[PDB]
Amino acid sequence: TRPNNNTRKSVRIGPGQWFYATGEIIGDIREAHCNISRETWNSTLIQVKE
Amino acid sequence: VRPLSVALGETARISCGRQALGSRAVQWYQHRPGQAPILLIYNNQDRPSGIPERFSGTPDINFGTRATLTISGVEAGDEADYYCHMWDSRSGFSWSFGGATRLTV
Amino acid sequence: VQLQESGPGLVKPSETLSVTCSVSGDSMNNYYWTWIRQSPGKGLEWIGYISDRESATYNPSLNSRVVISRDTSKNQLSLKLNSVTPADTAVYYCATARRGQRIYGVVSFGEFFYYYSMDVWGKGTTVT
Ligand SMILES: *[C@@H]1O[C@H](CO)[C@@H](O[C@@H]2O[C@H](CO)[C@@H](O[C@@H]3O[C@H](CO[C@H]4O[C@H](CO)[C@@H](O)[C@H](O[C@H]5O[C@H](CO)[C@@H](O)[C@H](O)[C@@H]5O)[C@@H]4O)[C@@H](O)[C@H](O[C@H]4O[C@H](CO)[C@@H](O)[C@H](O)[C@@H]4O[C@H]4O[C@H](CO)[C@@H](O)[C@H](O)[C@@H]4O)[C@@H]3O)[C@H](O)[C@H]2NC(C)=O)[C@H](O)[C@H]1NC(C)=O
Ligand SMILES: *[C@@H]1O[C@H](CO)[C@@H](O[C@@H]2O[C@H](CO)[C@@H](O)[C@H](O)[C@H]2NC(C)=O)[C@H](O)[C@H]1NC(C)=O
Ligand SMILES: *[C@@H]1O[C@H](CO)[C@@H](O[C@@H]2O[C@H](CO)[C@@H](O)[C@H](O)[C@H]2NC(C)=O)[C@H](O)[C@H]1NC(C)=O
Ligand SMILES: *[C@@H]1O[C@H](CO)[C@@H](O[C@@H]2O[C@H](CO)[C@@H](O)[C@H](O)[C@H]2NC(C)=O)[C@H](O)[C@H]1NC(C)=O
Ligand SMILES: *[C@@H]1O[C@H](CO)[C@@H](O)[C@H](O)[C@H]1NC(C)=O
């Protein structure tokens, strides 16, 4: 996940060329994280050990 | 310092002097002059014992909900000064109480 | 939980204001402690709070001229305030603090902030 709410800001840089940057962030400044279980990853590594 | 006038029996809506960015935890205080302040709401809905159920606040469900103290069935004992003490995730430590609301019915 | 304070009432400018608050009923180890000021015509101003291991953080607005101290030998909360001004002529209240922790994200990432809630208060004493 990327659990912080970001707004897309369109910046004019040329004729037809539109630069889409990150606008004002609202909500909570939170880190992007991934939950790779713990129980399945225990048995996966053990079968990697064998 | 902000006057608000409501009639008897109505639901009083006290808005905070500061607005919400991000997740919040708002504390509400009642301050009669010459009397001790009393805790009404902590963690944005929890009401300690001794506070009647007339006093209520909005829960923190998602973003955009304005922090408002609800006084249903206002009595003569609610004449005081009401405080919104706000914490949030981006302004850091909230050293100041913010603006004070002078309530007179 | 009852808190009863007592102060000197009047000092000359740049002297130390010392108020002594007696706390009775419960143990000292279970709560955080604080001091509250209320200027006349203005709001409530925090002046600081004390921790269990004698660590105090002060207001950037007050420019760190306030010292909050603690003496557990006689079961009381202490205060000292030097470099006083006529703007410090105010009503002082004593209270305790409960450190609340509102989680909004992952705990292991430090995605949380601490807040304090004040449940019991003193009666207030006026010094000039
Ligand atoms: C990858 O894994 C990590 C690890 O789990 C995940 O990180 C988690 O992220 C979530 C984000 O939502 C965190 O949830 C938050 O938890 C807060 C604390 O919850 C604990 O305390 C409360 C109150 O004491 C208890 O009720 C909770 O118990 C409940 O949840 C557990 C979860 O299993 C159940 O088992 C229980 O049975 C209960 O059901 C916890 O003990 C929690 O307060 C917070 O929810 C509030 O905040 C959100 C956002 O502001 C609001 O939308 C929401 O409505 C809640 O607001 C109410 O509660 C607050 C309480 O202060 C009030 O003030 C409000 O007014 C309102 O009433 C939120 O849910 C979770 O803690 C965290 N895990 C860890 C270990 O830290 C990642 O998400 C995950 N990623 C992916 C992609 O999966
Ligand atoms: C990023 O910096 C810009 C600098 O221009 C900020 O934009 C202004 O911010 C001030 C607040 O100091 C506002 O009063 C203006 O209205 C803003 N102007 C515009 C055009 O947005 C912007 O707010 C900053 N963003 C973040 C997230 O800090
Ligand atoms: C990843 O998230 C998904 C949900 O998007 C989880 O999958 C479901 O989880 C619920 C409750 O946890 C179960 O009732 C469903 O049966 C699950 N569905 C499937 C298809 O598995 C999943 O458990 C999450 N995994 C981790 C490691 O967090
Ligand atoms: C993520 O950001 C978008 C855009 O800033 C939010 O959409 C707005 O939400 C507010 C209320 O928070 C509404 O008043 C606006 O009308 C919405 N605008 C649009 C274009 O949808 C969105 O709610 C945010 N989501 C979260 C979870 O914070
Ligand atoms: C991981 O697996 C081993 C062997 O299967 C087990 O002894 C251990 O308790 C497991 N740990 C966790 C955290 O599940």
Distance CA C59, CA C18 (A): 19
Q: Is A35 in the pocket of ligand 3 (CB under 6 A)?
A: yes
Q: What is the number of other CB atoms lying within 10 angstroms of the CB of residue C94?
A: 25
Q: Where are the domains of chain C?
A: 2-127
B68 half-sphere exposure, CB direction, 13 A CA radius: 10
- Quick one: resolution in A? 3.5
Residue A27 in contact with residue B63, Cβ under 8 Å?
yes
Q: How many domains does chain B fold into?
A: 1
Structure tokens at C102: 């509102």
Residue B19 in contact with residue B37, Cβ under 8 Å?
no
CA-A5 nearest atom, ligand 4:
1
Pocket test for ligand 2, best of A11, A24, A26, A29 (most atoms within 8 A of CB): A24
CATH number for the domain harbouring residue B9: 2.60.40.10
Residue B85 in contact with residue B31, Cβ under 8 Å?
no
Q: Is A40 in the pocket of ligand 3 (CB under 6 A)?
A: no
The reply to whether B21 touches chain A by the CB within 8 Å rule is yes
Structure tokens at C127: 């010094």
- Sequence length of chain A is 50
| Nearest Cα to Cα of residue B26 among B69, B86, B70, B66 | B86
Q: Say which amino acid occupies C27.
A: S
Reduced to 3 states, what is the DSSP secondary structure of residue A40? Answer: helix
Query: In the PDB record, what is the listed experimental method?
Result: cryo-EM
- CA of B57 relative to ligand 1 center, distance in Å: 20
Residue C47 in contact with residue C34, Cβ under 8 Å?
no
Distance CA C44, CA B17 (A): 14
User: Which structural domain, as residue segments, surrounds residue B67?
Assistant: 2-103
Is C115's CB within 8 Å of B87's CB?
A: yes
- CA of A46 relative to ligand 5 center, distance in Å: 9
The CATH number given to C2-127 is 2.60.40.10
Is B25's CB within 8 Å of C124's CB?
A: no
Residue C75 in contact with residue C28, Cβ under 8 Å?
yes
